């Protein structure tokens, strides 16, 4: 009945935000392994679900064009002031990426070279719950396989929002839905494997041990290291997944998620070797995070995303 919108098809239902290409590149950000909920359903048109609503996003050289599908058989219209504020916070456009790029480049010759082609790579401000369970699914996994597990998980547990063409869109499920006695068995049938246990276990833990989603909001205003330790008490959440959530959901820009991916970049592109440590290891991984924080500064996590986006593309 209802189809995916393009800026040419139905320009009446679109709204713009003043945003240069230097500050944001949809094609780089929405497929850099930050969110796993956006798909380029038509060329230069990125469709995904955001806070129990579906969006389609496209851009020019100095404008970010966006349209909303409410889904509750409502009168179709342009995005509101509040819904545009939601998108502004989501891309964290209040922060100048140009000034950060220059600041990182001043102390890093390697970043300077990569910063040429790969501009407008910024960090999304994600829902802690969506981010947490998405990055529990990320362990020893590729972007395409993670995107599969998260899509299936949302269709099975999350509430249906709308159908556009052949794609049925579901919002991310609440903690109670993932904590049920059937949850792990269902999730294994959806192909999560060993990750199915950590999803149910972490959902049950946040509810019983930590007192629901308000905890993840407490970690948002808590300092980085208090938040990191707190997340590491959850089933299937270590330093890597804890740093990812910290960087991408809990506003900890100095959070540098360290696994084999940054290790490769650290060694090949920076000639880094563990100085204080003997032998990858928990101690060596922490040293590597401190190395990048010492080099790039309090937005070290944002810098890593630019090199990550560069290594993926």
- Which residue in the shown chain puts its C-beta closest to ligand 8HA? 33
- Using DSSP, state whether 53 is helix, strand or coil: coil
**Min dist. Cβ of residue 253 to ligand 8HA (A):** 10
Stretch that binds ligand 8HA, among 4-12, 105-113, 180-188, 300-308 (CB under 6 A): 300-308
* DSSP bridge pairs for 42: 45
Q: Which residues contact 299 (CB under 8 A, 6 or more apart)?
A: 100, 103, 104, 253, 254
CA distance 149 to 191: 7
Among the listed residues 164, 126, 150, 168, the one whose alpha carbon sits nearest the alpha carbon of residue 34? 126
**Min dist. Cβ of residue 304 to ligand 8HA (A):** 4
Contact status: 164 vs ligand 8HA (CB under 6 A):
no
Residues 34-53 contacting ligand 8HA, CB under 6 A? 34
Contact status: 251 vs ligand 8HA (CB under 6 A):
no
Taking CB under 6 A as the criterion, the residue among 68, 219, 244, 249 binding ligand 8HA is 244
* DSSP bridge pairs for 164: 167
Residues 256-295 contacting ligand 8HA, CB under 6 A? 257, 261
Contact status: 138 vs ligand 8HA (CB under 6 A):
yes
Catalytic (active site) residue 240: yes
CA distance 151 to 20: 31
* DSSP bridge pairs for 18: 63
Question: In 3-state terms, the chain is what percent helix, strand and coil (to 5)?
Answer: 50, 10, 40
Give the number of residues in contact with ligand 8HA, rule: CB under 6 A: 17
Report the interface residues with ligand 8HA, using CB under 6 A: 32-34, 138, 142-143, 244, 247, 257, 261, 301, 304-305, 308-309, 311-312
Known binding positions for DNA? 140, 145, 195, 261, 278
């Amino acid at each position: 009945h209802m189809r995916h919108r393009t800026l040419s098809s139905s320009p009446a239902l679109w709204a713009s935000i003043p945003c240069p290409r230097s500050e944001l590149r949809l094609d780089l950000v929405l497929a850099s392994g930050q969110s796993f909920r956006w798909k380029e359903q038509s060329p230069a048109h990125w469709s995904g679900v955001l806070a129990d609503q579906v969006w389609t996003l496209t851009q020019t050289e100095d404008q970010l064009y966006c349209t909303v599908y409410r889904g509750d058989d409502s009168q179709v219209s342009r995005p509101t002031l509040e819904e545009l504020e939601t998108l502004h916070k989501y891309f964290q456009l209040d922060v100048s990426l140009a000034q950060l790029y220059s600041h990182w480049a001043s102390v890093d010759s390697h970043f300077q070279r990569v910063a040429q082609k790969f501009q407008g790579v910024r960090l999304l401000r994600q829902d802690p719950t969506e981010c947490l369970f998405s990055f529990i699914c990320s362990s020893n996994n590729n972007i395409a396989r993670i995107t599969g597990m998260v899509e299936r998980l949302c269709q099975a547990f999350g509430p249906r929002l709308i159908q556009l063409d052949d794609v049925t869109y579901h919002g991310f499920p609440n903690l109670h839905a993932l904590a049920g006695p059937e949850a792990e068995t269902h999730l294994r049938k959806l192909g999560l494997g060993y990750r199915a246990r950590y999803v149910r276990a972490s959902a049950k833990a946040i509810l019983e041990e930590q007192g629901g989603p308000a905890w993840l909001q407490q970690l948002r205003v808590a300092p980085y290291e208090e938040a990191h330790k707190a997340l590491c008490t959850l089933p299937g959440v270590g330093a890597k997944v804890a740093d990812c959530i910290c960087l991408m959901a809990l506003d900890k820009p100095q959070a540098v998620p360290v696994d084999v991916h940054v290790w490769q970049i650290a060694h090949r592109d920076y000639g880094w070797h563990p100085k204080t440590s003997q032998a990858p290891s928990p101690l060596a991984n922490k040293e590597l995070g401190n190395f990048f924080r010492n080099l790039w500064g309090p937005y070290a996590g944002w810098a890593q995303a630019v090199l990550f986006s560069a290594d993926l593309r």
